[PDB]
Design a protein around this ligand. Structure first.
Ligand SMILES: NC(=O)c1ccc[n+]([C@@H]2O[C@H](COP(=O)([O-])OP(=O)(O)OC[C@H]3O[C@@H](n4cnc5c(N)ncnc54)[C@H](OP(=O)(O)O)[C@@H]3O)[C@@H](O)[C@H]2O)c1
Ligand SMILES: NC(=O)c1ccc[n+]([C@@H]2O[C@H](COP(=O)([O-])OP(=O)(O)OC[C@H]3O[C@@H](n4cnc5c(N)ncnc54)[C@H](OP(=O)(O)O)[C@@H]3O)[C@@H](O)[C@H]2O)c1
Lengths: 443, 442
């Protein structure tokens, strides 16, 4: 029953503005397990007072909650420590053992540090802090490398120290309906699976659009680009949920095993199935929509970093083969959308004596077929690791195959630095995206 | 082989010929959808002339002055022969009158049986024995009723199918509106697209609805002899089920798809009296129009009538693909709207929170939803010219159809139960929505 929630880097913005508040909300709605201590670790010489002061801004505290807020802060504590230094972890372990049932408690470690220090911490948590009786679960944060080779080093490290069932790689930086995406597509597989195949579907597009640009933090993004930001992780996860086979059960590792069989059968995307974009500002429109990506302090000058990407993948296997899977995601477009389109073959020529137009299944609140021509993301991902559900967290093999697919392309965008086709903030994207789609059988 | 066509309206004197058949061939001539060389010969006991038939029909033709040139050209090709229905002499005259037309000899002949099915036996016998072209094809259109039950249907069926081949027999049904072939075409399309889904592994409950917003519209006396189950369920709604529940056909031929339809029927068991709710519409005081007037306030409806004007019924397809999957048929006159829709509800179960049953809804693009030029008659007439039997009930399709509803129908005649009062423009009786919940229709 008893749980300890340890935030490493409890001083930083992620802990301050996101982690502390989102476990506040979770405890404030009786969603946390009854007996749950929150514990902060960092270098800074802080107390429970310092950490209410800096972090209650983002809590959205009211007059009626004044009693609960104090019951939450009764169960918090802090511990000074270098991330480099063993005795620091030794002090932390003993702190937790002293707490009520602290010797028997399950332990949930949130790594809210940069991945440069990840090696040191995994090795020290592993050496000194693991429960002898409870479960031990590490929440590791993006980025999980920037390429196959770098992701393979950081990962092979964590996975020599931690079983796969103690590793939770979290992704939440693409909005609060981001888990919802993964649940309806998984549901739409259970309903429509028998129809989702090459004998019924001529084309699939997975669209993920953000209407807003990189709004000042383009200094963190210019290191990564859109393929690493959205495509390699989220779109690919939603591709898998569409192309996978009804799983052997409803257990995390049976569906994860099925998302990987897809990924294994996707070969390395080459550059002439790729259309990259970059958002140049809008003269003709109000708000931050006047600011091109380039025109931002944090973005280096003449940086040829992709803001938009359209890609053609193929899932070379008996179920799908020659069925083009189109991935289309971008910043600073005309709307906020996550849609999958499954365009059928022209199957009604005889019935209606005329040439009838093409049919198509669309998912975005039951969704539809046409004819062309409270728990919110972060909240739900926290509970999932308290509940031991790894459904929505990427696996080791899953993550390697992900990078295997895009890594040759990405190294070519570093070496040869091509120029992203510019496109107006608010527009649908480069029009060479629409052409690529037509040439591969989109309507 | 040839380009010429004779259209023989047996009972051209009659009310169907006047208000529907002449108009609907007129409109087809008006739009050049008929063959270039089409003669139109009417036959009945009445001593009439083309001008007599012109005068009674032309009110229904809704003719404009632009069409007068086209319309003389039409009534030109019109002839009329008087004659009795079991008098061999008479039929001789008709054969001769056709033979005395340009290429009658080797023209295709199309016989519209616009008579009550009491003269069918003699009219069919005599057409076979006398009036059939010997180079051209010979096709018969038979009108409803296709008898009133299995035994009455089988007798007429057997007779006709001892004289004519199944490929000469066209059983036309066209009294349930204009988007009525449409209805059938789109449930076939969706079958093509959603077939692999449509089965007991994936689907909890199937429901096919046929609502009309109006009553018997003064012609209650005709309806009262038949009931809602003979008028809608045993014909058009049972075809909509066949089209949903049937196997990937072995080809895109009439006879192949109709084979697959019959396979579903063969496996449908006799509908049981305690899986049936019957309605009859009483008037709407607060309403206005015909909506003021109930079934029994039709002056042609005999007093004390219990004829069902609405019915819910529950069938099962007992085979592999379906089983413990109730098919619910719900139809009626004088209802809240005009609807022909199929609902397929899936099984209930990712969202760690009871998330409510989903269901696929084909209304006549349509959708999944989380719950809680030509018209029918023109098309069907063309279909017999152009030779397609796709949208016409095959003899054995029809035998099964009667087999399913015949025990219940006879139960209804014997026990004479009191159908439930439902207000004109109502949804139908509540006891219908109860039946559905007990078999799990959400
Ligand atoms: N889209 C994204 O993927 C995205 C967006 C937001 C955040 N993040 C993730 O957030 C994580 C943490 O960021 P944050 O917002 O919490 O702030 P941060 O300032 O990057 O790091 C948080 C804390 O870590 C410690 N720290 C920082 N740099 C360090 C270094 N070089 N060596 C040792 N300790 C160091 C500091 O705590 P003390 O000095 O007090 O010990 C600092 O307050 C990163 O891993 C990043 O990947 C990424
Ligand atoms: N909703 C429906 O299902 C529906 C509705 C309309 C029609 N129908 C069907 O359409 C067919 C014809 O309908 P209708 O309204 O045109 O019928 P009808 O007017 O009663 O019969 C048409 C012609 O048949 C002849 N006739 C009538 N009763 C006869 C009898 N007992 N014996 C011999 N000849 C007789 C008369 O011509 P002569 O005296 O000049 O020979 C009459 O002009 C029927 O089979 C009917 O069931 C179906």
């Amino acid at each position: 029953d008893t749980h300890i929630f340890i935030i490493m880097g409890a001083s930083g913005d992620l802990a301050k503005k996101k982690i502390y508040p989102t476990i506040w909300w979770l405890f404030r709605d009786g969603l946390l397990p009854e007996n749950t201590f929150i514990v902060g670790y960092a270098r800074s010489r802080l107390t429970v007072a310092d950490i209410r002061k800096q972090s209650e801004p983002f809590f959205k505290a009211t007059p009626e909650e004044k009693l609960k807020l104090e019951d939450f802060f009764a169960r918090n504590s802090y511990v000074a420590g270098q991330y480099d230094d063993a005795a620091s972890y030794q002090r932390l372990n003993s702190h937790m053992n002293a707490l009520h049932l602290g010797s028997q408690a399950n332990r949930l470690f949130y790594l809210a540090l940069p991945p440069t220090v990840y090696e040191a911490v995994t090795k020290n948590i592993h050496e000194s802090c693991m429960s002898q009786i409870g479960w031990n679960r590490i929440i590791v944060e993006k980025p999980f490398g920037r390429d196959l080779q770098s992701s393979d080093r950081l990962s092979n490290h964590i996975s020599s120290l931690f079983r796969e069932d103690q590793i939770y790689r979290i992704d939440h930086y693409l909005g609060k309906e981001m888990v919802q995406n993964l649940m309806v597509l998984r549901f739409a597989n259970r309903i429509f699976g028998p129809i989702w195949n090459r004998d019924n579907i001529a084309c699939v597009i997975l669209t993920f659009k953000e209407p807003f640009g990189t709004e000042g933090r383009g200094g963190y993004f210019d290191e990564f680009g859109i393929i690493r930001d959205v495509m390699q992780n989220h779109l690919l996860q939603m591709l898998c949920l569409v192309a996978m086979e009804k799983p052997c059960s409803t257990n995390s590792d049976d569906v994860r095993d099925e998302k990987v069989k897809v990924l294994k059968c996707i070969s390395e995307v080459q550059a002439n199935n790729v259309v990259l974009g970059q958002y140049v500002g809008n003269p003709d429109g109000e708000g931050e929509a006047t600011k091109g990506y380039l025109d931002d302090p944090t973005v280096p000058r003449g940086s040829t970093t992709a803001t938009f990407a359209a890609v053609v993948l193929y899932v070379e296997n008996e179920r799908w083969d020659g069925v083009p899977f189109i991935l289309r995601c971008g910043k600073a477009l005309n709307e906020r959308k996550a849609e999958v389109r499954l365009q059928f073959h022209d199957v009604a020529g005889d019935i209606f004596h005329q040439q009838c137009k093409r049919n198509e299944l669309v998912i975005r609140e039951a969704v539809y077929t046409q004819m062309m021509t409270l728990p919110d993301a972060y909240e739900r991902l926290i509970l999932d690791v308290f509940c031991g559900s790894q459904m929505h967290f990427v696996r080791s093999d899953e993550l390697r195959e992900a990078w295997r697919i895009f890594t040759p392309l990405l190294h070519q965008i570093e070496l040869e630095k091509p120029k992203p086709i510019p496109y107006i903030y608010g527009s649908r994207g480069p029009t060479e995206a629409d052409e690529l789609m037509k040439r591969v059988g989109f309507q």
